[PDB]
Structures are given as C-alpha cells and as structure tokens.
C-alpha cells in the first residue's frame, strides 16, 4: 500500500524510466489512474504497477 501526498492505493513500486518534467508530480494513465508518481521527499520518480 502506497500513499504519496494523500494519493493512496495498492500496487508494486519500481524505479521508473519516464522522464517527468520538473513540474510534474504523477503520470496519469488512459483509465485515469496514476501509473507514475514522484517521491515527495526526493527527485525520484517511481512507477506503480
């Protein structure tokens, strides 16, 4: 179970190869579900599966 800034859900976290622009916080999928999130306390970008 993951919770980033209140964005809460369940899934497996992994390191992401997506190149988020510096102002982007999460990547939204076709089904309007967050498939990628920035770690709030780091520059790290993680992919949700």
């Amino acid at each position: 179970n993951f919770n980033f800034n209140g964005l809460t859900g369940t899934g497996v976290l992994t390191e992401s190869n997506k190149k988020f622009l510096p102002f982007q916080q999460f990547g939204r999928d076709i089904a309007d579900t967050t498939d990628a999130v920035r770690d709030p306390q780091t520059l790290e970008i993680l992919d949700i599966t």
Partner: protein, 206 residues
C-alpha cells in the same frame, strides 16, 4: 499592426505526465490563425488590455524589455504585480509600488518572489485564484515574424496571488514583440513517447 499567429501559444495544461497519447482538454488557449497585435520599440509605452489571459512573444538580445506590470488601476493606488529582470535573476513583487505612466530606467506591499537570434514566448493567466506563467525560449532566424512552427510552453512559476486584473504593460529601459489574447477552447494534444507535446489540433477552428 497585426499578424496571424500560426499555431504557437499552446502550453502543458496541467501538472500531469502523459505519453504516446492523444489527449483532449478544455482550457484557455490562443486559437490558431488568430491575429496578434504587433509592436515595435522606439523612444513611448503603448497601452494594452487584459482579459482571461495573454500570450506575449518577443525577439531581442539587448534586454530591451525588462519585465511587465499587471493590475487594474496601475498608477500606484491598488495592488499590482511587477516582474523585472533584476540584473540576472528575475524578481516578482505584488505591491502598490510607485510608477510613472510610462516608466523606464537607464543603463503596503504584499508579495515577493525571486528566481534577435532568440525568440521568447510567454503565457500569463489568472485562474482559480492563481497567477500562472508559462514560457518557451527558442533560437530563430525570422527576426521579422513569429515563425511557422510549433513548440509547447511549460510553466515557469505558479503563484497564489488572486488579485484582480484588467490591464498590463511592458517595461523597458533607456540605452519588437507580439501580444494576443486567450480564449476558452477545446484542444487535442499529441503526447509523444518521451512525454512532450509535439503537435496539437484546435478543433473549433474548422
């Protein structure tokens, strides 16, 4: 003077990432092929209105324009926003600071923040209480006109100011730009594999 804007003036509408997808969104955009008023630098300071938002492009290398003013009654009796290139850093200040009617320099405040071969584009909009700035910097050879081409703008800063606006003015100094207003439009943006908007369709156009 007037000149058509071809397609430029589109910006990443939200703070969300997307890839390899056609995404439809309703937002304040600069409609394609609309005339944008053209101005040139000499001596004066032309007046401009401001509604919904504005897209503002320029081309220069001598820093002829240093920044902007935004407000309703600009003559130093209500809260207004002043943006200026300090010397190398960029400073934004919301205050009732004193201006002339055509201020320029030589060679109760409420908010503070700090940061011809080139063409710089900006979008300023006041929505949901926030003042949002988007920008793009690009090398160019068409010193005369904003070129036939495409490139999306990305936010520079996003302030929670919330003041009222009906006008704005450019700021210069003593030792060549275009302005066009936004409208609410539905756009279709093509996010490429790397997540950058490579093309768009203003599908209220035709």
């Amino acid at each position: 003077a007037y000149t058509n804007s071809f397609t430029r003036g589109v910006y990443y509408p939200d703070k969300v990432f997307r890839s390899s997808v056609l995404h439809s969104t309703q937002d304040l955009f600069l409609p394609f092929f609309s005339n944008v008023t053209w101005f040139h630098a000499i001596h004066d300071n032309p007046v401009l209105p401001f509604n919904d938002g504005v897209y503002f492009a320029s081309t220069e290398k001598s820093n002829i324009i240093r920044g902007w003013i935004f407000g309703t009654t600009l003559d130093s009796k209500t809260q207004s926003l002043l943006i200026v290139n300090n010397a190398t850093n960029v400073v934004i200040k919301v205050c009732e600071f004193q201006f002339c009617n055509d201020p320029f320099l030589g060679v109760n405040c409420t908010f503070e923040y700090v940061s011809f071969k080139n063409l710089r584009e900006f979008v300023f909009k006041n929505i949901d209480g926030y003042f949002k700035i988007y920008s793009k910097h690009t090398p160019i050879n068409l010193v005369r006109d904003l070129p036939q081409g495409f490139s999306a703008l990305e936010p520079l800063v996003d302030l929670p100011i919330g003041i009222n606006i009906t006008r704005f003015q450019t700021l210069l100094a003593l030792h060549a730009y275009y302005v066009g207003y936004l409208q609410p439009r539905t756009f279709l943006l093509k996010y490429n594999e790397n997540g950058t908007i490579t093309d768009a369709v203003d599908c209220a156009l035709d």
